[model samples]
Target: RLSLEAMLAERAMVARQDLAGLKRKLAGADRVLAPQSPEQCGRESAQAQARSVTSELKSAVKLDFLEQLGEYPVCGILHGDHPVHPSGTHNNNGKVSVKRQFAGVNTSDALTCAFRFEDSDLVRETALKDGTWAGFVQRLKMQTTRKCVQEKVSRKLLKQLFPYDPQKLVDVSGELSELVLGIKTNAIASAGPPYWRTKRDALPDMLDCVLPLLYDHIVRKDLTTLRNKHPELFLAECKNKTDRYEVESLGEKTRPYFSHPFHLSALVSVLSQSFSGALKIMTEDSTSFNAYGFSWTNGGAEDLAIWARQAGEAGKKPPRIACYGDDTDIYYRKDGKLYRICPDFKQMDGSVDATTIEAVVDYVVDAHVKQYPTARQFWEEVGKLWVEMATQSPFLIDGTKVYRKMQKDGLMTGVVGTTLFDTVKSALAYNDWADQLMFGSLNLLEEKYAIEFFKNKHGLVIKEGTWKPALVNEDPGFGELWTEQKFLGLQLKVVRRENEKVYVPNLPFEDWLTMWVTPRSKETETMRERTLFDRARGLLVTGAVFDERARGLMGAVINSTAPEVVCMRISDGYPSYDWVVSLYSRDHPCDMPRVFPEAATLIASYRKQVMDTRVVI
Candidate 1:
């Protein structure tokens, strides 16, 4: 009987036998892309990086430098001499500054400091027409969706594994960059990057060289490469939360849930678009910040108050606000008593009663009309203006006192631990983005004012629900699956079981920590910064976003790297704002305390041997 080991060994050997020139080129690839000098390490120019990519690639895809991409200058980061300024205002240096854009400590991060202004000057010059999301990922993933295909995205990813025998050799890199970008970027993502997207132009081009192989092992599916070849890229996050938890104990399959390459682009689009929108609304609606919850736009800020004749007359005291995350504020109590009055129908048959609700609604509306002539904007908590990243951001608005991060811990959301003192039931990925609804809502609910206002402020009431709360899959009290609810166009359905809480579309990693690390951490951390470091270190060994060795390349070039800070330049202008373009412009130290010598040796070997390598998107 044929053994599986023999079959695989024989296949690889046979495939590589006839490839004379290919192996010849592999010897010369010792030219790993390095920062020209240690002084400039992480912040290399776009063109320098791009030229290095073409050289190391062995001319697999011949492409000329698009000179126009490098020329577009964006607003500068507010640092050193660059002082803060009001939005759209120029700094003392005659250039727009980061302070004028979204709220941040600094604009050292490479993305546009202000809004990305594209008047269509980019594409007209680059002349490289964007190929809508197509090629490798689509062909391989076709077997999925409602209609399964004979083909698969996973299969296409490991092109080296395909037949390379006595016939003509399969050139993986021949159409590699083009096809990879087509599939890698979101089909729906704008093929536009602001002129100021990168500090340098060729940087995006440099990434074009190796994204496919990088995405495959990291995201396309669980690790298919034998760990023996590159153990650094294969170790999962499942280390030591419990006595039994081992690295090998984590998931070991072609887990379909691994992030889709396409969504990588999509996440960026959402983040960028949402962040940009938030800035616009802040300026447009600053006058009515009090009327709305907090900078909610399109006439919704005026709707923060609620009217009630006797809402919450039948009140049942809830568990202490302590029962939910500190981020939550269950603010509806009257005269030292917590109350919610709903018809006894869902209480009995579990069907909501309309009559009692309508009476309360009409009376409330009449009373509401007496106070203000204008109708309140639609919905609660946040309104029609959707800022997808709020769950991940520090911006909180329910009622009174904006929510904030744990300064000492550097935590935005509270501790997502299972221990007795756990503050929050869930946490956002520590790196960036708090894209949850309940996060902001809970912040406001902590105040009695927010709860009192929204409780009675109904127009018509089929509403058995108050405050669209979702504890997210922990168990009944906390983890019960929310019956799918759609508000406006936002969907707050279960993106994953009990790991996270939100109402949106297309989530990449279900559990925040595990998305970056393999073998999900058993216990959520009280101090996630350490855990976050563990995630970063593990990822570098495994590979960061771009190629197999991509994470390492970034580290060598950058001063120091951390797990929570993966850099996602707008490499190929993929979809986002989904799986996205997060770039860690400067460097920060990592906090992890452990290491595997075997993996460390493997990484060093790769650093010396394979020159090519690294994305949020």
Candidate 2:
């Protein structure tokens, strides 16, 4: 036999070789039969497939996983088989970063959840019954009610998802069934609130607690509808400190909502009307008070005096006191305030007793009467001035100019001369001394006759003493004495100066045959002069008319210049009468009368004076 060491060694070598082969085969089998880990399958297949699918839908869907699930990684896990990327990725610290596949999966889940929740029968039906979603549902119904030819599938899907309330659906179905059967259902329902009103009511309530914190989010995101609907409520609720913190946490992720133009307009209109209505109510209730004829107390006087004294003490001018009866009223700054002085009992009615109310009233009234003598005087003067203007000589220098300008401006074109002149004359006839001579003496007869015969007939009146004579003279019986005499001739000269320019010398009336009688004149001279002047004017006018007729130019001259001729004849005979008359001519066919009276008088008087006197010429 072989050596024992050789045999053992050979046997051990064979066994080792056999065991190595077996171990190799088992390792090979293990490699072939072992199951793949889920992680590996996800990386190689599920992840690839997810990525490809997400790529395909990338543009078609919006990923809102965080918003919908109210959590980050949970949404990512539901979307993708791959393990979620951890929170605080390098790209986004303090936030979640979803891989593309995970993002797609999360988006799909969010969409599915939103669609189910927002359009589910339970949510829709509950919303409808609660009266909260009625308005929004009605809008959807209006849009989808009709049969759409091209979008039939979309319409059907919408109806299925956002189905009306069961009652409404059943009622509509029943009615449709009845129509198909040629039968009508007996159901009546009122239309809901208008879109604007519904929005207004809902938005305010919804936004009540949300706006203050989320104002920037709402405005930037265009959440006007929610803000407007619940403006008051939103403003009130969102003002809390906690709400602001919550809003800040959302950052730029919040979505924007906006109101329609019409709704916005309605909101503004309501607010404007509210403010305007308040103002109108206040204006309607404001009342005005009138203070007049009240009494003043000594207490009131003292109070007023105290105010005046205080004003002086402050180095300011004394405040003026306005009194009505016993009450002392002050007018300063902008408003009216009343004050009173305390009365001293020992001073009034010789009484040692305590001050009575009557004494106070009397003292106040007396003090007011004393302090406001100037005020009373001012009112009394005003009254006297009014009486003077009304019953005496109202024609102040300014008054004369006012009337003159008024006439020049054509304001008084319709007024008759006699009416104006009589008003002026009566206003001037109030002088005491002039009244005695003009209304009492025998000269009064001449005035009465002239007023009745000439003034009433032709609208002429004596100018009286208010005007100065045109001429000046040193002779005792000249212009100055003529004015003193109250001579009608002299008065006429003065009036002519106002009406038209003219001059006269100190010519004696007695020597001229037409005696210009004084206020103490002989009766014969006055009557004779009056009769002659009146008859002469009448005769001249009559002669002018006859002359026009005799010439067979009746319409032409009579209409054209006859009035002027008649006026000139009268003015010419009376040395102091100066006036012109405007006449419209038939032949000339002028639509308007000439500017007459003063203009014509000036021309006529100049011609007459030049022709009669060498010096004038």
Candidate 3:
């Protein structure tokens, strides 16, 4: 029969009591460690206890004040669920009420732009590490064979959450600088003062000051609720197509999926590792094409121009390209009939909703066949649409050619919306990766070219019952890696902004990694970047290499090719590349069991059965 406030107050009282006990222990340990009383065993034990007690005290104090701040307005937004209530007063009229607000934009409006961050960007450098299947498999085998403790990495992250100084609370000139300086940078105002005028060494520290509280009260709680209870609320895309549909309803459902209430360093590592793994899987075997089916078409300007000229001469029209918010399709004419080039299986399964795809296909076909009469004219219009598509740099352009916002204001660079989209995409990327690793071979069966080539030319028949694609999760080496749900859970930086409206800048890799590695620009600065980069790469490997061959491929990619982008510095102020370091440098693994024989055995089998076989095709 305790009230909520009373319960919280009791918790605070307990924290203070615990704080007192810790202070006593810390004092005794400090005295034992005094130079006058240095005993090798007692001193060492005292030092350890002192360290533990100090950390404990900090944690207790943090919890105490955070609980007190729970009801305060500044802490209120970051304290609980961002539930969507009814927008306006309902009069109980005959007509149903409509929702006006969404996560970032209105129902009828969306963002228009030219560039969006891509999943391929996450793994393209990793691709350069290895170019061959055998090389990749070899590397994966090594990673899978090594038994390590995931707690080492996870502990490293959890340890960073505390070490906070209560007396240091946002009062110093340094802390004030982070707040005042941060405000100017976050504004979307035109004709603002020049950005580079101040040569401040750091970005905003506002997040740093408040992050501990937000993480303890908001992010962790929301993650638990999201995972155990209202999982369906994490659904990102909406099925409602009508104008009357409340965009906020859909946004609220998806907002929880992508939007973090605050920034946490551990969440960054999760995103980095998960996304890299997704890219690794989607990029497997075929490095030239990404999961989105965008062919790298490296240095193909002349080739594309030549092809276009030939098509023009042959009186062939450009393919009918339809870009949906969550799905896209390209239809071309073959023998006077329209043929569709389906998306990569990963995209088909995860990115596109069933209804969205159906609507896109129907609209594209109608416009191409029923609406436009002439082939040349119709294709010209389609061509214009294609250029427009590239011009807008839209997040999604549906078959009907209406731009759709995944979340409102998400496309704007450095906005919380962008972070939300990135987090959402990263989570989805891991899901795509796990799906492909488990069931990817099934997708390859539909590749007519490879199947026909193997069957007729190499005399290799892959009978369904005889040769089953290996279930990756069945093996111990690949089993303990994180999943999409974990990725979403670890994205605990979900605290949002209200009237202050400042854009939350990402903490730099050096700043995030100082505890793990040497501080920035110190002796061994190169080693610091290199060490963190190595950790990030390790994380990428562990995150996605559930399959041995995949791990091998990742190693080959790592050892053979440099993370070219990670090395290149764009400008003094840019933070994206630092994030790339984090993406690769996150976590290690645990020792449940290590089994890598399958990849090695499978590769040897591949070598004997296929690599050495004679093909006449």
Candidate 4:
């Protein structure tokens, strides 16, 4: 393991080396891109005369690859020198903009990593486990990432919250390998046990294909820097090029440059380095941390249903999931109709009132007179339809479960458990009921809950009719809570696009890896830098992701695309903006249902073992 302090010091040290130069760059740095696109050649087509080497290059691969350089038609990224944006390229406005409402959330804490299709594991565990990947040497960087986080974040909180290792957060190795391939189209495929499996070897070639693309990206970035430092080269390279209108200075302490040429290992490390503080205060009680959003303490919006269900199990009025889905059998009401509305009518006493969304509809929106209805039976049927969890995992062609722990030999593996998988599996089984069912995608279940709560927020503040009022705008409109208010433990005010008020907690729920990059006035050295930051952030809030976005937490295509657009406006080509945003809203119904309540007491007894945070924020 490496010393995270040492690792971070290197960056600061290197930055200081060019302190004055860096200050000048930052002062004038209104962007992180070049004004003009880089030419697609090592040497100008034939040198100082053309844009690229089209006159005398014969490498087919190079030509074809260069053709599609810098232009992402899917999300409207043009072949311009700057980062893609809503109206134009170069500017990271719209969805990617920094001023976007709630866009400057704690993305630092939201360290969610995903598969880049880096490299599938070539070797299965059944093999000698001999081979390793020829991937980039950035693996070493990941150690510092974990070590850094261990030092910065609350280590006691992690052990206290759950034994989940930070290292496991990002799967460094392992990809699904098809057990069966090259099967005859219709011919009876081999009826033997299936073959593919998830390869977990540490050594697999993960960068060859993706590296080339990254190189082009980084190369352009380098050229931009070069042109900025030496304007003469700018004029020398592009013969017809004019003024200083085509460059963006990469920031001195910039967030991860995920857009350009980057390494997954290094990216993860850097991500951890920036956001480790997010999870810092989660486990501390007497702490009013306002956190809300997808990647919150437990599972964010992904596991909202789990919270609702467990709450139900505890005999409390937990929120309800917008239960609706594919056509299938749900309930057989007294009417003999295959009871199908949304939620299985037989499960609860009635329909979950659409109006009271924040908390689960408790007193019954529409009572079900069905003679025989029960929760156990309700979940039982829904479980049958789900692909995984309810029933056992799918069997391979040979009637064996595709996911095998370890065949024969007592040789087991490292850190294998299914805490998350198992809960998701159990949560499945039913979608919608009440009328014997229909469905609403598990899309905005969380937002639906929030909306319900927002509109009818009396539930959270009321204590047995004692009227413990918080600053809730009862009968709140769709645009409620964007103003300065402390709903859970977090307090914030926001006004999209205006020089208006917009802020974040960042409360109990930690934000993802965003807000840091979205330049705030305080964090900036230059007025231009702050202005650009505000403009970009302002444009983003205008998108459907903010109010209609993460603020709703979740939503469906019908009422809203909050969940869909919150992360990334589909048109912007990035879907991650919303995914990593962690809400600081402390009072989610999910927070009430302590999945590991037992652990709390268990840890309290061992206070000596759980270390207090050495570095206080």
lDDT winner = 3
lDDT of 4 by residue, 403-491 (tens): 22111111010001111111111112221111112232222223344224312321111112111212222122333442232222222
The top-ranked prediction according to TM-score is 3
Model 4 accuracy (lDDT, Cα): 0.21
Quantify all predictions' global Cα lDDT against the true fold: 0.22, 0.22, 0.24, 0.21
In the order shown, what is each candidate's alpha-carbon RMSD? 29.3, 54.6, 29.1, 30.1
> Which of candidates 1 and 3 reaches a greater TM-score?
3
For model 3, the stretches where C-alpha displacement exceeds 4 angstroms are 1-206, 214-274, 281-284, 287-289, 292-617
Q: How good is model 1 by TM-score?
A: 0.18
| Residue 152, model 1: Cα distance from true site in angstroms | 35
Candidate 3 global Cα RMSD: 29.1
Ranking under lDDT, best-scoring first?
Answer: 3, 1, 2, 4
